[PDB]
Design a protein around this ligand. Structure first.
Ligand SMILES: */C1=C\C(=O)NCC/C=C/[C@H](NC(=O)[C@@H](NC(=O)N[C@H](C(=O)O)C(C)C)C(C)C)C(=O)N[C@H]1C(C)C
Ligand SMILES: [Mg+2]
Ligand SMILES: [Mg+2]
Ligand SMILES: [Mg+2]
Ligand SMILES: [Mg+2]
Ligand SMILES: [Mg+2]
Lengths: 196, 222, 226, 195, 204, 125, 212, 233, 195, 196
C-alpha cells in the first residue's frame, strides 16, 4: 500500500494506489483505499483491511450521530475519534490511517495515526509499505501553499515512485480533492504515471 | 514480552539488641550496571516505634511500605489509638504479602523495634509472607557476604575458649548499641569492597524506648 | 570495565580502571588491564579477561619472533592485522575487545578492535561497560593538538567517569604513555581514589579459638639420604 | 493410584485394588483402601491423579446417599453408573477435569444379577464380565479371556483373581504391595481379610 | 545441571608475615546426597600447594595432570617448580581447553624458595589469573568466603594468628552453604615447615 | 612429487661410523674460527666477520645472534644452516617454553631443544 | 528439610530439623517447622514455608470457630480435612505443601494425617516428609515398636532427624521435639545438630565413618 | 502487554541553587526511521512544573491529556486554584507514579520513563523519576535512556552530591545540560539536533525554550581518518 | 540397572546387586548378575544405561586380564580402580559417553586389607567403608551410618546388608526382584546362594 | 549505513556516510566506509563491519598478487573476486558491497553485490539501510554523463536525505572521485548538507 495526503492553497488532496495483496497474490488490483467518513472528511487506509474498514465504519457512524446533534464536525474531531479507537484497541488492531479534511474556518488539514494510536498534525503525510521509498523525494519536493495542479503532480509523481519500487503497491492512482468548491475524484492509469 | 519485575540492588541489615534494635541499609539504587541514585532512602520509620525495609524490586518495596504505613493509621482509627506491637505488625505484614501470593511483591522485608517486654526485636519475611523473629538478619544483594560474618561475630559460632580446645564454647555475652553499630559499619564496608551494587552511603535507624534515631555514614562511590 | 585511548602531539596514551568482576561480585580490586604486546606497543582489553590476556600474549609472542626475523622494531599495524585476523577466524567466540596503541618507525597510532574482527581508527576511543561515561568526557574536552600532559589528564578523567558512574568499573586508574623517540612509560596505579577506610574493629582472634582434631607435619622435602 | 481389577461371576462381583500409595520417591502407605461404598449393594473402586480420586469418590458417595435418603430406595447399579458417567463426561470439558478412572461393582436386587461397569476419566462406560484400568488389563486379560466362565462360583472367581495378581507381581516393575479384595452380592459388601 | 555446583566444596588461601595459609572443606556430594567426608581438595607438588574446587572428576584429573607435569619439570629443570611459575602453568593448561573447559576453581599457595616471598593466586575455569596480595576464595560458598575474608583479614598476621583467621573464615562460610562442610583442613605454610590441621565442625 | 625420501640418509658404516655426521664436522672444521669464554660475572662470544666481498655490507650479515634477551649464539661452518637454526631456536623458545611458563627458557634447556632439532636431521628421512 | 511424626503407645512423637535453603545458600538454621495450630494440634512444615505457615495458622482459626460453635474439641479427622479441602480448591495454582496434622482425642486416640498440596489426605502410623525423608525412614522402620516408652520414642525421633541432618545437604541446624498427649502437646526442646552429632557418636558408637 | 511503536529518546535534568532544569529532543522515532521531527516531549503543568517524557509517544499523548484534565479538575470549586491550592510538582508526580504502578500491576503498562521537574510552594527544588514499572527515585541529576549512561556522568561532575546544589548557578547548570545534549547527539542514533529546554526557578518562574539546536560541533578531525587499519589514501 | 550396594568389613568386601532387568513396561529377567570378576581378588558391580553397562564392564575385564597375563601379576584394587576412573573420565568428554556407575570391591593381598571403591560415570572416585549408586544410598546410608563398625565380621556385614535390603523392599516403589550377594576376601570371590 | 556509487562523464564517484552503530549507540561517528582495494578500484561497505573488512582485505591481497603477475586488473575482475567470496560463503557472511573503478579503456564502472552474492552492473548503485528512503529521489534525479560538479551535488543531496531519515546513518559525507586525472577525496560536514 502507498497512501498520502497533502494540504495546499485551496484545501487538501488524498492519494492512494489500488493494490491489495495476500502474500504475493494480488487479491484486488482496483481497490478504493480513499474512504469517506464525512462529506469533506476522508481517510487513507493501510494495514489490516478488515481492521481499517471496521474502524472507518465506526467513525462514519460516530460523525453521522455527531452531525445530527452538534452540526458539522471538525477534521480534528474526526482524527480524535479515529485515535480513540486505535489507541484503546492497540493490542488487537493493525491499522495505519491518514485523516484529511476541509473546513471553511480551518481550511485543509492532515492528521496521521500510526500503529500505536498516536496523532500527528502535519502539512502532508505519507504511509503504507510503499511510503518508505519516497521519504527522500517527498521531503525535497513538498512546498506549502501549492496550487491544485502542482499538488496533483506532486502526489502523482510521489506515488508513481512508491508503486515502482514497492511490490505491495500498484494498479491505478486514485485521488480525492477537498476544497470549498466540493469533492472531486481523480484517477490515473499505469500508461500515464509509469512514463513520468 | 513485558517483565513486570526489576532488580534495584541494595542490601539491608537488622540486629536485635537486649533493649534496642537497629535496621540498616545502603542508600544506592541501581538498574543493571547504572546508578539511579546515590542517596535513595530504603529504611523507613512507620510509626509506633517500628522501622521497616522492603528490599529488592523498589516499586514493590515502596508499595508494601506505603500499605503497611496505611495499615498502622487504620489500626489506630479502628482500635482506639492502640499501639501496634511489633508481633502484631509482623502478622499483619504476612497477610499483606500473602494477599499477593500468586503475583508476589518481589522483596525481602525486614522490620525492627521492641517487643511488649521492651526487648529488642527483628522480624524477617520472604516474598510471599513466611516470617520469623530473629536476632540477626541481612537481606538483599550482599546478604550472603554479611550473614556468615554475623554468625561468627554476633553469635560466636565456631569460637571456643582458649586452652580447652573445642570443649568449652565462647559465652554469648550481650552487645551494646555502640558495639552493634561497629559490626554494621564493618559489614557494609566489607560488602562495598566485594559487591558492585553496594556503596555510596549507609543509613542506620536505631530503635529504643526513647524513640527512633538516625545515623548516616559515607560508603565508597565506585 | 573502562578503557580509553587518546592521541596527542608526539604520541599516544592509553588508560584503564582496575576492577574485574564475576557477575555482581568483584573478583580482583586491583586488576591489570594494560597489556604489553611489545616494548612500545601496548593495548587495553575489555570483555572476557582470559581471552584479552591470551590473544595479547599470542600476538605479542608472534610479534617478537617477527621483529627478530625482520631485524625491525614491531609496527602497530602488524599487531592490529594479526589480532583482527585471529579474532575474525574465531567468529566472536574469543571475547576480546581491545584498544591498541603504540609508536614505531612509521609514527604514533591508535586503533580499536572488536571480538568479531572489525577495527577502527581514531584520535580518541573508549571500550567496555563504562565506555559511554568515558566517551561523554572525551567528547566534551577533546581537541586537536593536545600536549602530553593534557592527554594524560583527559584519559584519566575519562576513566574516572567510568569508575564513579559505571558499576562494572572501579578502584584505580592505570596509564601507559607512548611518545615518539622515547621509552614507553607504564604508570601502574597512576591514580588511587578508592582506598578503603579503617575498620571500626579488629577481628584478630584469641589463639586457641578454633577447635582442632588432628595435627601433623607435611613432608614437602624430597626423599632424604642415609 | 495403580492397579484396580474387577470380575463378575455367577452371583457376585469381586473388586481387587492395590494397597500402595507412592509419592514419587517413597511408598508412604501399604494398606490404602481405594474404594467407597456408594450404597449397601454398590461398591466403587478408583484410580487416577492424587487428591482428585478420593475427592471424586466421596462426592459420588455423598450424592448417592442423598438420593437413598430422599426416596427411601436404593438406585440400581445401572442407574448409579450412568450418574457417575455423566459427572465424568461433564468434568472432561471443565476448567480442570477429574483425572479419575473407576470400576463400579453392584448387585441388582430387582434382577438378582451381579453387574460390573468400567468407566474412565473421559466418561467412557462399558458393562463387562471382567475389567481393569491402566496397565492392569495388559497383564491380566489374557488369563481372564482363557479361564473365565459366566457360571463361576465366588471361590473360583477368587482363585482366578489370585492367578491374575501373581502374574502382575511377576511381570510388573512397580511393587503395588498386594491387593484388598471385596465381594458384592445379594447380602451386601464384605472384605476378604486374607489374600 | 551446573557442573561447578554438583559436588560442592570450598577453598580459601591467605597471606601472612613470612607465611601463607590454604584451607578447604572435606565434602563430596551428589547434589543433596552427601557421599564422602574425606575428599581433600588441597594437593602439593614440592613446596607449591594447589587447592581445587568444582566438579570432582576434574579436580582429581587436574591433580594427576599437574603431578605429571611438575614431575617432568623437575627431571628436566633439576629443581622444584616455584609458585609464580606453576601459576603460569595452571593458566596455560586451563586455557588450552578454552572451548571445552575443566569446571574448576583452582587456588595456588606457596612461598618462593629463593626470595622467601609469600605467594597466592586464583583462577577462573578458563585460566584468568587473580594474583591478590591479601586472599583468594573459591567454590560454592565463594560469596560467603568473600564476606568473611574482607572483614576478618588484616595484613602481616603471624602464622598462629593467620590459622585462627583463615579457619574462622572457612568454617562460618561453609555453615551458610548446603554443599560445603563435613570437615575441614588448614595448611599453615612457612619457608621450611608445613603444619596440617583438621578442624572440628558441625556434620550437617 | 611428494617427498619419496622417507629413509635415513645417515647410516652406520661397518666400522660404526656415521659418515654424514663426520663429514658435517669436516665442514665445521673448514669454517671461520669462533670462540666463547665464561667469566664470573658474564660470558663473551666472538668470531671474525669474513667478508666475501668489499662491496658487501658485512654489518647486514649477523654471525652473532640474540636467541632470547638473556641468550646469544655464534657458529662455525655453513652460514645458511646457522641462519635457519637461529629462526627455529627463537621460535622453539616461545612455543615449547614461554607460551607455557610465561618466562624465557634457561640456557641448558634451549640448548637441549636446538640439540634435538640437530639430532633429528641426523636420523629423519 | 526433614519432618517426621509417628503414633505409639504414649501418643505421638513429632520431630523436625531447622534448616531453610535457597539453592545452595543456607537462609536459616533456626526455622520453626512445627506449627502450633492450637494447644492440642500440631502441623509440620515442608514444601512452601509461607503456604504451610499461612494456611495452618488459618486452620487454627477454623478449629477455634468449630469448638465455639459445637462446644466440643474438633477431631483430627475434621481438622485435617478442612486443610485438605482448602488446598484442593487451589489445586493447579501452585501451592506447595507436605504436612502431618497430628492430634490426640478421646474418640480417635492418637491420630496423624498426611496432608498434601495436590489434595492427598492419608491417615497412618508413621510418616516422613522432606528432602531427607528417606534417611529418617531407615532409622524409624528398623527401630519402631508400638510399645516404645515416651523416653525411647522421643530419642528415636531425635536420632532419625540426626541421620537425615548428617546425610541430606538441605537438612540440619537443630532438632525440635514434641510429644502429643490427649491433654495437649508437650515441647521437648531445641537440640543443635552440631553438638548432638558428637554426643550421639560417642554414647552410641555410631558414625564410625566420621572422625571425632 | 504491548510494544512501543513511535518513541522518544533521552530526557535529562538537574538541580541548581534556585531551581531545576530539564531538557529533551524533538524527535519521534519509528524504529530506526527518524519519522517525526517536531514532537514536544516537555509538557508544562501550570507555572511551577514541567513533566519530561520518553518512550512510547501514543502513551505520552495519553499522559498529556491526563495532566490537562488534572488542571481542569483542580480548578473545580477551588477559589484558590491559582494560589494556595494550585497543583504542586509533588502532587503531579505522586499522581503519575500511582497510575504507572497500577498499570504495570494490571500487566498493561504505559511504556514510558518520566521525570517531573519543578519548584514547590516553599521554594524547594523537586526532581523525581518514574517509569513503566512504577519504579521511582530522586537524585541531584536525573536522566532517562541513553541520558542515564552519558548525561548523568557529565552532570554529576557539576553536582556530585546534595551540598553541591547551592554552589551551582543557573548559567553553569544550563551550560552543562546543553553540552550533555550535544554529546547525546554525537552518540545516540535515535537523537536529533533540535531540542527543547525548560528552567523552573523560584524567583524568575518558568522559562520554556523551544527550537534550540546543538551547536559548536567538532567534525573537522574526520578528514584525517582513513581506512580501518592499514589504508593510507 | 537399579540398586547396587557395597560394604567393606574387617576381612572382606561384600557387594549386593539387584536381579531385575526392566525394559519399560515389562520385567524381562529376575536373575541378572550385574557384576564382573576383573581378577581373582577383584570384583566390579555396575549400573547405568542399557548396553553400555555390560559393554564397559567386559571391556574393563578384558584389559585387566590382559595385564595379568602380560606381567604374570595381579594389580592391586587401588591400581584397578584408578585405571577404571581414567577410562570413565576420558569417556565423559567423548562423542557418546559411557553412562555407567560402578563399585569395585577388592582384597589387597599385599596389604591384607579389603578395599571398596565407588566410581560414577563422570570418573568421580572415592574409597569408602560402604557405598551405593542411584537412589540406593538415600534409603540405606542412615542404617549403615548407625550400625557400621570397621571390625565387623563377614556374617555381621551380611546381617546389616539384609536390613538395608529390607528397607529398600519396604520404601522403594520399584520391584528389583531381590539381590545377588558376593563376598571378596583373601581366598577370592564367592557367591552367597541363599539371600 | 548509506552508501552509493555513481558513474559520470569523466569516471565514477563513491559516496558514504560515517556512522557506525551498535544498537542505538553510535560506536564511531567518523567511520571511513570508502575502502581501497586497488589504486583506482574502491568499494563501499555495508552489513557486518567485521565481514566486509575481512572480505576487502582478502580482495586487496588478490588484486595485489594479480597486478604483480598480469598487470592492472579491470573493475569487472575486482567485482568477480568480491562475488566469489560473497557467494561461496553466503551462509556465514552478512555483506552488501558496491564496487566502483576507473579504467582508461572502460572508463567509470559500478557493480553492486547484495546479500546473496549476485553481481549487477549498473550506471549507479545505492545500498545500506538508508538507501531505502532515496530510491524515489535517485531514480528521478540521476542522469547519464553528468559533470563532476553535478555528480557531487547528486550524491551530496541523495545521502543528505538518507541521513535525514535513517537513524543508522549520519556524521560526515565522504566521497572519493575516480578519473584519469587521479584519486580525489572529498568531505562534507553537517552544517553544509543539512541546509540543502
Ligand atoms: C571488563 C568488564 C567487561 O568488559 N565485561 C563484563 C563481563 C566481564 C568479563 C570479565 N570477567 C571475567 O572474565 C571473569 N571470568 C569469566 O567471566 N569467565 C566466564 C564465566 O562465565 O565464568 C567464562 C570464560 C565464559 C574473571 C575476572 C573471573 C571482566 O571482568 N572483564 C573486565 C576486564 C576486561 C577485566
Ligand atoms: Mg484483527
Ligand atoms: Mg509495484
Ligand atoms: Mg563504578
Ligand atoms: Mg554446611
Ligand atoms: Mg545436612
Amino acid at each position: 500500500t502507498s497512501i498520502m495526503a497533502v494540504t495546499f492553497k485551496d484545501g487538501v488532496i488524498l492519494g492512494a494506489d489500488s493494490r491489495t495483496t495476500t502474500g504475493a497474490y494480488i487479491a484486488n488490483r482496483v481497490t478504493d483505499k480513499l474512504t469517506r467518513v464525512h462529506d469533506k472528511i476522508w481517510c487513507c487506509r493501510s494495514g489490516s483491511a478488515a481492521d481499517t474498514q471496521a474502524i472507518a465504519d465506526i467513525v462514519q457512524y460516530h460523525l453521522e450521530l455527531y452531525t445530527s446533534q452538534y452540526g458539522t464536525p471538525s477534521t480534528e474531531t474526526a482524527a480524535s475519534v479515529f485515535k480513540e479507537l486505535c489507541y484503546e484497541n492497540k493490542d488487537n488492531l493493525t491499522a495505519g490511517i491518514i485523516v484529511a479534511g476541509y473546513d471553511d474556518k480551518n481550511k485543509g488539514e492532515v492528521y496521521t495515526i500510526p500503529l500505536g494510536g498516536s496523532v500527528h498534525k502535519l502539512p502532508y503525510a505519507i504511509a503504507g509499505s510503499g511510503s518508505t521509498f519516497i521519504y527522500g523525494y517527498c521531503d525535497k519536493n513538498f512546498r506549502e501553499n501549492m496550487s491544485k495542479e502542482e499538488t496533483v503532480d506532486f502526489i502523482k509523481h510521489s506515488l508513481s515512485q512508491a508503486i515502482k519500487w514497492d511490490g505491495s503497491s500498484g494498479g491505478v492512482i486514485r485521488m480525492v480533492v477537498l476544497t470549498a468548491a466540493g469533492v472531486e475524484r481523480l484517477i490515473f492509469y499505469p500508461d500515464e504515471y509509469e512514463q513520468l | 514480552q513485558f517483565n513486570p519485575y526489576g532488580d534495584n540492588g541494595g542490601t539491608i541489615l537488622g540486629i536485635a539488641g537486649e533493649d534496642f534494635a537497629v535496621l540498616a541499609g545502603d542508600t544506592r539504587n541501581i538498574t543493571d550496571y547504572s546508578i539511579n541514585s546515590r542517596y535513595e532512602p530504603k529504611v523507613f520509620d512507620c510509626g509506633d516505634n517500628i522501622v521497616m525495609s522492603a528490599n529488592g524490586f523498589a516499586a514493590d518495596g515502596d508499595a508494601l511500605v506505603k500499605r503497611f504505613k496505611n495499615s498502622v493509621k487504620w489500626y489506630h482509627f479502628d482500635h482506639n489509638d492502640k499501639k501496634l506491637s511489633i508481633n502484631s505488625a509482623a502478622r499483619n505484614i504476612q497477610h499483606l504479602l500473602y494477599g499477593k501470593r500468586f503475583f508476589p511483591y518481589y522483596v525481602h522485608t525486614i522490620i525492627a523495634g521492641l517487643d511488649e517486654d521492651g526487648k529488642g526485636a527483628v522480624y524477617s519475611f520472604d516474598p510471599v509472607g513466611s516470617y520469623e523473629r530473629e536476632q540477626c538478619r541481612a537481606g538483599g544483594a550482599a546478604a550472603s557476604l554479611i550473614m556468615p560474618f554475623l554468625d561468627n561475630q554476633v553469635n560466636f559460632k565456631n569460637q571456643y575458649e582458649p586452652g580447652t580446645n573445642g570443649k568449652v564454647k565462647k559465652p554469648l555475652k550481650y552487645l551494646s548499641v555502640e558495639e552493634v553499630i561497629k559490626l554494621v559499619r564493618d559489614s557494609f564496608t566489607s560488602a562495598t569492597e566485594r559487591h558492585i551494587q553496594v556503596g555510596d552511603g549507609l543509613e542506620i535507624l536505631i530503635v529504643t524506648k526513647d524513640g527512633v534515631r538516625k545515623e548516616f555514614y559515607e560508603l565508597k562511590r565506585d | 570495565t573502562t578503557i580509553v585511548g587518546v592521541k596527542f602531539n608526539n604520541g599516544v596514551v592509553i588508560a584503564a580502571d582496575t576492577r574485574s568482576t564475576q557477575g555482581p561480585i568483584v573478583a580482583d580490586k586491583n586488576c591489570a588491564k594494560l597489556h604489553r604486546i611489545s616494548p612500545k606497543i601496548w593495548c587495553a582489553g575489555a570483555g572476557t579477561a582470559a581471552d584479552t590476556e591470551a590473544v595479547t600474549q599470542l600476538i605479542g609472542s608472534n610479534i617478537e619472533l617477527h621483529s627478530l626475523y625482520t631485524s625491525r622494531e614491531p609496527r602497530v599495524v602488524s599487531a592490529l592485522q594479526m589480532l583482527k585476523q585471529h579474532l575474525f577466524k574465531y567468529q566472536g567466540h574469543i571475547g576480546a575487545y581491545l584498544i591498541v596503541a603504540g609508536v614505531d618507525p612509521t609514527g604514533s597510532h591508535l586503533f580499536s578492535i572488536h571480538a568479531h574482527g572489525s577495527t577502527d581508527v581514531g584520535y580518541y576511543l573508549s571500550l567496555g561497560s563504562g565506555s559511554l561515561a568515558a566517551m561523554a568526557v572525551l567528547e566534551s574536552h577533546w581537541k586537536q593538538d593536545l600536549t602530553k600532559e593534557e592527554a594524560i589528564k583527559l584519559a584519566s578523567d575519562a576513566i574516572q567517569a567510568g569508575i564513579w558512574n559505571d558499576l562494572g568499573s572501579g578502584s584505580n586508574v592505570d596509564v601507559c604513555v607512548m611518545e615518539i623517540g622515547k621509552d614507553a612509560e607504564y604508570l601502574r596505579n597512576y591514580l588511587t581514589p578508592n582506598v578503603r577506610e579503617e575498620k571500626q574493629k579488629s577481628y584478630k582472634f584469641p589463639r586457641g579459638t578454633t577447635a582442632v582434631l588432628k595435627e601433623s607435619i607435611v613432608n614437602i622435602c624430597d626423599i632424604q639420604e642415609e | 493410584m495403580d492397579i484396580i481389577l474387577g470380575i463378575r461371576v455367577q452371583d457376585s462381583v469381586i473388586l481387587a485394588s492395590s494397597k500402595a500409595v507412592t509419592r514419587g520417591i517413597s511408598v508412604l502407605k501399604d494398606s490404602d483402601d481405594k474404594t467407597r461404598q456408594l450404597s449397601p449393594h454398590t461398591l466403587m473402586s478408583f484410580a487416577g491423579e492424587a487428591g482428585d480420586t478420593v475427592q471424586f469418590a466421596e462426592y459420588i458417595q455423598a450424592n448417592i446417599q442423598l438420593y437413598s435418603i430422599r426416596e427411601d430406595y436404593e438406585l440400581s447399579p445401572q442407574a448409579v453408573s450412568s450418574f457417575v458417567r455423566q459427572e465424568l463426561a461433564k468434568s472432561i470439558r471443565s476448567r480442570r477435569p477429574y483425572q479419575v478412572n473407576v470400576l463400579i461393582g453392584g448387585y441388582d436386587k430387582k434382577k438378582n444379577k451381579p453387574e460390573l461397569y468400567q468407566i474412565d476419566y473421559l466418561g467412557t462406560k462399558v458393562e463387562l464380565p471382567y475389567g481393569a484400568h491402566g496397565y492392569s488389563g495388559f497383564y491380566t486379560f489374557s488369563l481372564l479371556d482363557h479361564h473365565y466362565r459366566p457360571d463361576m462360583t465366588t471361590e473360583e472367581g477368587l482363585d482366578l483373581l489370585k492367578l491374575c495378581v501373581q502374574e502382575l507381581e511377576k511381570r510388573m516393575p512397580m511393587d503395588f504391595k498386594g491387593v484388598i479384595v471385596k465381594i458384592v452380592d445379594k447380602d451386601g459388601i464384605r472384605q476378604v481379610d486374607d489374600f | 545441571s551446573d557442573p561447578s555446583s554438583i559436588n560442592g566444596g570450598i577453598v580459601v588461601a591467605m597471606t601472612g608475615k613470612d607465611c601463607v595459609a590454604i584451607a578447604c572443606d572435606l565434602r563430596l556430594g551428589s547434589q543433596s546426597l552427601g557421599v564422602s567426608n574425606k575428599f581433600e581438595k588441597i594437593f602439593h607438588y614440592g613446596h607449591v600447594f594447589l587447592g581445587i574446587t568444582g566438579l570432582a572428576t576434574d579436580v582429581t584429573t587436574l591433580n594427576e595432570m599437574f603431578r605429571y607435569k611438575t614431575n617432568l619439570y623437575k627431571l628436566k629443570e633439576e629443581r622444584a617448580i616455584e609458585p609464580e611459575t606453576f601459576t603460569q602453568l595452571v593458566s596455560s593448561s586451563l586455557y588450552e581447553r578454552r572451548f571445552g573447559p575443566y569446571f574448576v576453581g583452582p587456588v595456588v599457595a606457596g612461598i618462593n624458595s629463593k626470595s622467601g616471598k609469600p605467594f597466592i593466586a586464583g583462577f577462573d575455569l578458563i585460566g584468568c589469573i587473580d594474583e591478590a596480595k591479601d586472599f583468594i576464595v573459591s567454590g560454592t560458598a565463594s560469596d560467603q568466603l568473600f564476606g568473611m575474608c574482607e572483614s576478618l583479614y588484616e595484613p602481616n598476621l603471624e602464622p598462629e594468628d593467620l590459622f585462627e583467621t583463615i579457619s574462622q573464615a572457612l568454617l562460618n562460610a561453609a555453615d551458610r552453604d548446603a554443599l560445603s562442610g563435613w570437615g575441614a583442613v588448614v595448611y599453615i605454610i612457612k619457608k621450611d615447615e608445613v603444619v596440617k590441621r583438621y578442624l572440628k565442625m558441625r556434620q550437617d | 612429487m611428494t617427498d619419496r625420501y622417507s629413509f635415513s640418509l645417515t647410516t652406520f658404516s661397518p666400522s660404526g661410523k656415521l659418515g654424514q655426521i663426520d663429514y658435517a664436522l669436516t665442514a665445521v672444521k673448514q669454517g671461520v674460527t669462533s670462540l666463547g669464554i665464561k667469566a664470573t660475572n658474564g660470558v663473551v662470544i666472538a668470531t671474525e666477520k669474513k667478508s666475501s666481498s668489499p662491496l658487501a655490507m658485512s654489518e647486514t650479515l649477523s654471525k652473532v645472534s640474540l636467541l632470547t634477551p638473556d641468550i646469544g649464539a655464534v657458529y662455525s661452518g655453513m652460514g645458511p644452516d646457522y641462519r635457519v637454526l637461529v629462526d627455529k631456536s627463537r621460535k622453539v623458545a616461545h612455543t615449547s617454553y614461554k607460551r607455557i611458563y610465561g618466562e624465557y627458557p634457561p640456557t641448558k634447556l634451549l640448548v637441549s631443544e636446538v640439540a634435538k632439532i640437530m639430532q633429528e636431521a641426523t636420523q629423519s628421512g | 528439610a526433614t519432618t517426621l511424626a509417628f503414633r505409639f503407645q504414649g501418643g505421638i512423637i513429632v520431630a523436625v530439623d531447622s534448616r531453610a535453603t535457597a539453592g545452595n545458600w543456607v537462609a536459616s538454621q533456626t526455622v520453626k517447622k512445627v506449627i502450633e495450630i492450637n494447644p492440642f494440634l500440631l502441623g509440620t512444615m515442608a514444601g512452601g514455608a509461607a503456604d504451610c505457615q499461612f494456611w495452618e495458622t488459618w486452620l487454627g482459626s477454623q478449629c477455634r470457630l468449630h469448638e465455639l460453635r459445637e462446644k466440643e474439641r474438633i477431631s483430627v479427622a475434621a481438622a485435617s480435612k478442612i486443610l485438605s479441602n482448602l488446598v484442593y480448591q487451589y489445586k493447579g495454582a501452585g501451592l506447595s505443601m507436605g504436612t502431618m496434622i497430628c492430634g490426640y482425642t478421646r474418640k480417635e486416640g492418637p491420630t496423624i494425617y498426611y496432608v498434601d498440596s495436590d489434595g492427598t489426605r492419608l491417615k497412618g502410623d508413621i510418616f516422613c516428609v522432606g528432602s531427607g525423608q528417606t534417611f529418617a525412614y531407615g532409622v524409624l522402620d528398623s527401630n519402631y515398636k508400638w510399645d516404645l516408652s515416651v523416653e525411647d520414642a522421643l530419642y528415636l525421633g531425635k536420632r532419625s532427624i540426626l541421620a537425615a541432618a548428617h546425610r541430606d545437604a538441605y537438612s540440619g541446624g537443630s532438632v525440635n521435639l514434641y510429644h502429643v498427649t490427649e491433654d495437649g502437646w508437650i515441647y521437648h526442646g531445641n537440640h543443635d545438630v552440631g553438638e548432638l552429632f558428637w554426643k550421639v557418636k560417642e554414647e552410641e558408637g555410631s558414625f564410625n565413618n566420621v572422625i571425632g | 502487554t504491548q510494544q512501543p511503536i513511535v518513541t522518544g529518546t533521552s530526557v535529562i535534568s538537574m538541580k541548581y541553587d534556585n531551581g531545576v532544569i530539564i531538557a529533551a529532543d524533538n524527535l519521534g522515532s519509528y524504529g530506526s526511521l527518524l519519522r517525526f521531527n517536531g514532537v514536544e516531549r516537555l509538557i508544562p503543568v501550570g507555572d511551577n512544573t514541567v513533566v519530561g517524557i520518553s518512550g512510547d509517544i501514543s502513551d505520552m499523548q495519553h499522559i498529556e491529556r491526563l495532566l490537562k484534565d488534572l488542571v481542569t479538575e483542580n480548578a473545580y470549586d477551588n477559589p484558590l486554584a491559582d494560589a494556595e491550592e494550585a497543583l504542586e510538582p509533588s502532587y503531579i508526580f505522586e499522581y503519575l507514579a500511582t497510575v504507572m504502578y497500577q498499570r504495570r500491576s494490571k500487566m498493561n503498562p504505559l511504556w514510558n520513563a518520566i521525570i517531573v521537574a519543578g519548584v514547590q510552594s516553599n521554594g524547594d527544588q523537586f526532581l523525581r523519576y518514574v517509569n513503566l514499572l512504577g519504579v521511582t527515585y530522586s537524585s541531584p541529576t536525573l536522566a532517562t535512556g541513553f541520558g542515564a549512561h552519558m548525561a548523568n556522568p557529565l552532570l554529576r561532575k557539576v553536582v556530585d552530591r546534595e551540598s553541591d546544589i547551592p554552589k551551582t548557578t543557573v548559567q553553569v547548570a544550563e551550560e552543562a545540560i546543553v553540552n550533555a545534549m550535544r554529546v547525546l547527539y554525537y552518540r545516540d542514533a535515535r537523537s536529533s539536533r533540535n531540542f527543547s529546554l525548560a528552567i523552573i526557578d523560584k524567583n524568575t518562574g518558568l522559562t520554556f525554550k523551544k527550537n534550540l539546536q546543538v551547536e559548536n560541533m567538532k567534525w573537522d578531525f574526520a578528514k584525517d581518518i582513513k581506512g580501518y587499519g592499514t589504508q593510507k589514501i
